[PDB]
């Protein structure tokens, strides 16, 4: 394993696909915001539905999330404020209305 790593995040947002590198120790939301992408949120603490997305491709660490149940994680749900990439990932954002 590397001392330092980042992963390519592809977000499929309502206004288009956007891509950026996300450090492996920065949450998806935080890294998107630093690149000027506006994503939904409210609690920023892993305990609500606001920042929900769907993982389409790759792997995440969501140890820091709590609101999604184990079946929802198995089904690909993501709380973007509380998720770290562990590989390159593609995530569809703005999926709250779907819960
Ligand atoms: S903004 Fe509440 S869980 Fe992410």
Curated annotation (Swiss-Prot):
<keyword id="KW-0001">2Fe-2S</keyword>
<keyword id="KW-0479">Metal-binding</keyword>
<keyword id="KW-0249">Electron transport</keyword>
<dbReference type="GO" id="GO:0046872">
    <property type="term" value="F:metal ion binding"/>
</dbReference>
<comment type="subunit">
    <text>Forms a complex with heterodimeric ferredoxin-thioredoxin reductase (FTR) and thioredoxin.</text>
</comment>
<keyword id="KW-0411">Iron-sulfur</keyword>
<keyword id="KW-0813">Transport</keyword>
<keyword id="KW-0408">Iron</keyword>
<feature type="binding site">
    <location>
        <position position="48"/>
    </location>
    <ligand>
        <name>[2Fe-2S] cluster</name>
    </ligand>
</feature>
<dbReference type="GO" id="GO:0051537">
    <property type="term" value="F:2 iron, 2 sulfur cluster binding"/>
</dbReference>
<dbReference type="GO" id="GO:0009570">
    <property type="term" value="C:chloroplast stroma"/>
</dbReference>
<comment type="similarity">
    <text>Belongs to the 2Fe2S plant-type ferredoxin family.</text>
</comment>
<feature type="domain" description="2Fe-2S ferredoxin-type">
    <location>
        <begin position="7"/>
        <end position="97"/>
    </location>
</feature>
<keyword id="KW-0934">Plastid</keyword>
<feature type="binding site">
    <location>
        <position position="43"/>
    </location>
    <ligand>
        <name>[2Fe-2S] cluster</name>
    </ligand>
</feature>
<keyword id="KW-0809">Transit peptide</keyword>
<feature type="binding site">
    <location>
        <position position="81"/>
    </location>
    <ligand>
        <name>[2Fe-2S] cluster</name>
    </ligand>
</feature>
<dbReference type="GO" id="GO:0009055">
    <property type="term" value="F:electron transfer activity"/>
</dbReference>
<keyword id="KW-0150">Chloroplast</keyword>
<protein>
    <recommendedName>
        <fullName>Ferredoxin-1, chloroplastic</fullName>
    </recommendedName>
</protein>
<feature type="binding site">
    <location>
        <position position="51"/>
    </location>
    <ligand>
        <name>[2Fe-2S] cluster</name>
    </ligand>
</feature>
<comment type="function">
    <text>Ferredoxins are iron-sulfur proteins that transfer electrons in a wide variety of metabolic reactions.</text>
</comment>
<dbReference type="GO" id="GO:0022900">
    <property type="term" value="P:electron transport chain"/>
</dbReference>
């Amino acid at each position: 394993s590397p001392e330092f790593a980042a992963y390519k995040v592809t977000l499929v947002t309502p206004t288009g696909n956007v891509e950026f590198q996300c450090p492996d120790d920065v949450y998806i939301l935080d890294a998107a915001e630093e690149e000027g992408i506006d994503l939904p949120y409210s609690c920023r603490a892993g305990s609500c539905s606001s920042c929900a997305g769907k993982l389409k491709t790759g792997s995440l660490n969501q140890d820091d999330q709590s609101f999604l149940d184990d079946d929802q994680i198995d089904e690909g749900w993501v709380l973007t404020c509380a998720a770290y990439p562990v590989s390159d990932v593609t995530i569809e954002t703005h999926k709250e209305e779907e819960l």
